[PDB]
A paper describes a structure:
The transactive response DNA-binding protein-43 (TDP-43) is a multi-facet protein involved in phase separation, RNA-binding, and alternative splicing. In the context of neurodegenerative diseases, abnormal aggregation of TDP-43 has been linked to amyotrophic lateral sclerosis and frontotemporal lobar degeneration through the aggregation of its C-terminal domain. Here, we report a cryo-electron microscopy (cryo-EM)-based structural characterization of TDP-43 fibrils obtained from the full-length protein. We found three different fibril structures in our sample that share the same basic fibril protein fold and differ in the number and relative arrangement of the fibril protofilaments.
Morphology-2 show a width of 10.4 ± 0.6 nm (n = 50), while the fibril cross-overs are hardly visible and no crossover distance could be measured. Approximately 59% of the fibrils visible in the sample correspond to Morphology-1 and 17% to Morphology-2. The 3D maps reached spatial resolutions of 3.76 Å (Morphology-1a) and 4.05 Å (Morphology-1b), based on the 0.143 Fourier Shell Correlation (FSC) criterion. In the case of Morphology-2, it was not possible to identify more than one 3D class, and the 3D map of this fibril structure was refined to a resolution of 3.86 Å. Morphology-2, finally, contains three structurally equal, in-register fibril protein stacks, and the fibril is C3-symmetrical. Despite these differences, we find the interfaces between the adjacent protein stacks to be formed by the same two amino acid residues (Met311 and Phe313) in the three fibrils. The three fibril structures contain essentially the same fibril protein conformation that is formed by 45 residues (Gly304 to Gly348) from the LC domain. All fibril proteins contain arch that is formed by residues Ala328-Ala341, while residues Gly304-Ala326 are wrapped around this arch.
Numbering used by the authors:
A (entry chain L), B (entry chain I), C (entry chain F), D (entry chain C), E (entry chain O), F (entry chain R), ...: 304 to 348
């Protein structure tokens, strides 16, 4: 169980990610102030 | 069970992601202030 | 069970994602202030 | 069971996603202030 | 169980990541002020 | 169980990572003020 | 004559008082955003 | 004549008082964002 | 005549007082963002 | 006549007082961001 | 007439007073960011 | 007439007073960022 | 062609202009939250 | 063509201009949160 | 073409201009949070 | 073409200009948080 | 083309200019947190 | 083209300019945290 502390940002975040994912399995996520992503990908051989 | 603290942002976030995903499995998500995505992708071989 | 804290944003978010997903399985989502997406995609081989 | 905190946004969100999804399975969603999407797509091989 | 302390940022973060991931398994994530990602990927040989 | 202390940054962080990962297993993450990523990848031979 | 300044609260107040008063004289009051109570109780001996 | 300045709270106050008063004279009050209580209790001996 | 300056709080106050008062005279008050209480209790001997 | 200057708090105050007062005269008060209490208690012997 | 200067606190105050007062005269007060208490208690012998 | 200068604290004050006062006259006060208490107690013999 | 950005005010504006204009040409305007006045006055000599 | 950025004010503006204009040409304007005035006055000699 | 950045003010602006203009040409303007005034006055001799 | 960066002020600006302009050409402007004034005055001799 | 960087002020600016301009050409401007004034005055002899 | 770096001031600026300008051409400007003034005045002889 992870634990994190609260934070307030009044500043001007500018994020410019650009992505291109091609794989047997691929996931892409982009977010701003807050987010929570749990992605388990099991590929059997 | 994850735990996260609350946060207030008064600043001007500018996010410019751009995406293009082509894979056997592919997922794409983009969001702003808040979000929660649980994606488990199991591809058997 | 995930846990997240509340947040108030008075600032001007500008998100400009652009997407194009072509895969055996593909999902696309885009959202603003709040959202919750649970996508499990199991592709058997 | 996910848990999320409430948030009030008085700011001017501008989201400009643009999408084009062509795959064996494809889903597309776009939303503004709030939303909840549960999409499980199982494609047997 | 991880433990983290709260932090307030009033400064102007500018992040410019750019990504391109192609592998047997691939995941991509980008975020701004806060986030929590738990991705376990087990690929059997 | 890790323990970390809280920190407030008023300064202008400018991060310019650029990435390109292609491996049997690959993960990519980029973030700004705060984040927590637990990625265990076990590839059997 | 008391003087007070106006205040606007957009946040989520949660008050959980619980009371049990038994005395020769007893008064109980509970209120939310605004209120004004003038209670003078003179018990002669 | 008291003088007070106005204040705006956007944050999430959580007050959890719990009370139990038994005395020759007893008064109990609980309130949230604003209030004004003038209670003079004179008990002669 | 008291004089006070105005203040704005965007942070998450958490007050957890708990009380139990039993005396010849007793008063109890609990409040959140703002309040003004003038209680004069004269008990003659 | 007292004079005080205005103050803005964006931080997370956590106050945990706990009280129990039993005396010939007793008063109890607890408050958060702002307050003004004038209590004169004269007990003649 | 007292004079005080204004102050802004963005940090996380944590106050944990705990009290128990039993005397011929007793007063108890606890407060957070701001407050003003004038208590004159004259007990004649 | 006292004179004081203004001060801004961004740091994490942690105060842990604990009190227990029993006397012919007793007063107890605890506060955080700002406060002003004028208590004159005259006990004639 | 002028360009201006949108703004939301929740605060208590108090404007107390007072005017008295006597000239060969004279115009007087007073307004609150929003307004747009284009007055061209050409007086030939 | 002028360009301006948007701004949100939650604070208590108090403007107390007072005016008295007597000239061959005279214009007077007073406004609060927002406004746009284009006044060209050409007086030939 | 001028360019300006957006700004949010939560503080208590108090402006007390007072004016009195008497000239061959005279203009007077007073404003609060935002405004844009283009006044070209050409007086030929 | 001028370029300016955005700024957020939470502090209490107090401006007390006072003006009195009498000239062949005269302009007077007073403003608070933001403004943009382009005044070209050409007086031929 | 001028270039300027963004700045955030949480402190209490107190400006007390006072002006009185009488000339063949005269302009007066006073402002607080932000402003942009382009005044070209050409007086031919 | 001038270039300037961003700066954040949390301190209490107190500026007390006082002006009185009488000349063939005269301009007066006073400002607080930020400003940009381009005044070219060409007086032919």
């Amino acid at each position: 169980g992870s634990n994190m502390g609260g934070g307030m940002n009044f500043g001007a975040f500018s994020i410019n990610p650009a992505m291109m994912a091609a794989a047997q399995a691929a996931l892409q996520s982009s977010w701003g102030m807050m987010g929570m992503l749990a992605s388990q990908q099991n590929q059997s051989g």
